[PDB]
Amino acid sequence: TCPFYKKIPGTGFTVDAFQYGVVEGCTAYFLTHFHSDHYAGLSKHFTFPVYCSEITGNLLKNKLHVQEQYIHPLPLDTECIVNGVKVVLLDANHCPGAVMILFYLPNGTVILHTGDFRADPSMERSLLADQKVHMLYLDTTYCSPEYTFPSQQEVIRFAINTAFEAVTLNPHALVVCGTYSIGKEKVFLAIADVLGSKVGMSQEKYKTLQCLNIPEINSLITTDMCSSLVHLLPMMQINFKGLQSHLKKCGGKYNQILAFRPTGWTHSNKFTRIADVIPQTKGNISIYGIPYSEHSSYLEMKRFVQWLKPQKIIPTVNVGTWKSRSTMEKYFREWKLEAGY
């Protein structure tokens, strides 16, 4: 049974609610982005209307084989009427094709569902500026002050300089980047660009990247592993055993691996600056964990909410424990009292 926080009151609408069978009274199923916890339950046998971005719609069609007649892509930043309700999709600054949804209820209530997002000051000048929001369904993944991480720009800077130094020292070194879903493509694309290489990867991963409307992509990626000095692998294979094995595969073309694991937050963030980060090393293999987040830091989340001034907040993440729920409600009250709404 569908939880309350995936339902939009006063509508026939649900959000990211595909694993509950037929939801009673739902006339349209919205999908914020193509990550598995959110699409869980969709397949080629789905027969209700799905509303999403163009990119999410490319992945539904090609990866999950949802039939075209049930895919309803919408442009961003555009007022659209769905089953007699005005909606807008806004960029979520999460993975490719990820959206926030603004719903304009017939009784005059306005609701924003953030899906998954990384709040940014640029959102203060979207169509959100133009009117008041009564309810906010919030991505609360990192809603605690211990969750600090650097900007995406500083993290990419650190990775580019690290890779460039290593491969300029040893032209026979290979760079490997782990992946398990879309998102974080900047990590591998930036490193390949500085090394003047294409990124090599499996056929299934190449297919996924081909759905993403990235400019000049045929120039950046390939399935020819042996022509490439940046390889993508599944995240699970980014360990000493997995990498030793992969090094064998290239047929003595390479004598050193430098590998990156983009994680979200890790408790090394409560001590270490990005400048200061060091790998784990075993012989000719080094592994860097780098804190590339596609979710709001605590500070970025607080800033967005105190700017938005919602009348009520409904968390969509960390909702399964009483201790979590109680922590989150405390911070919402602090923020409201400090800003005065």
Residues of the shown chain interacting with Ni ion in the complex, contacts defined by CB under 5 A: 35, 116
Least CB distance to Ni ion at residue 164 (A): 30
Least CB distance to Ni ion at residue 36 (A): 9
48 or 180: whose CB is closer to Ni ion?
Answer: 180
Nearest by Cα to 185 from 136, 162, 152, 229: 152
183: left (phi over 0), alpha (psi -120 to 50) or beta: left
34 or 51: whose CB is closer to Ni ion?
Answer: 34
Nearest by Cα to 110 from 93, 128, 124: 128
86 or 186: whose CB is closer to Ni ion?
Answer: 186
- E-assigned strands of the chain? 7-8, 13-15, 28-30, 50-52, 71-73, 80-82, 85-91, 99-104, 110-113, 135-138, 173-179, 199-200, 221-222, 230-234, 256-263, 280-282, 285-291, 312-315
Q: Give alpha helix (H) positions in 43-131.
A: 54-62
- List, in sequence order, every residue forming a beta bridge with 314; answer none if it has no partner: 137
58 or 293: whose CB is closer to Ni ion?
Answer: 293
Least CB distance to Ni ion at residue 72 (A): 21
Least CB distance to Ni ion at residue 180 (A): 11
117 or 332: whose CB is closer to Ni ion?
Answer: 117
116 or 300: whose CB is closer to Ni ion?
Answer: 116
Least CB distance to Ni ion at residue 192 (A): 24
- List, in sequence order, every residue forming a beta bridge with 104; answer none if it has no partner: 86, 110
Least CB distance to Ni ion at residue 273 (A): 27
End-to-end CA distance of the chain: 35
Q: Give the number of other Cβ atoms within 10 Å of residue 216's Cβ.
A: 6
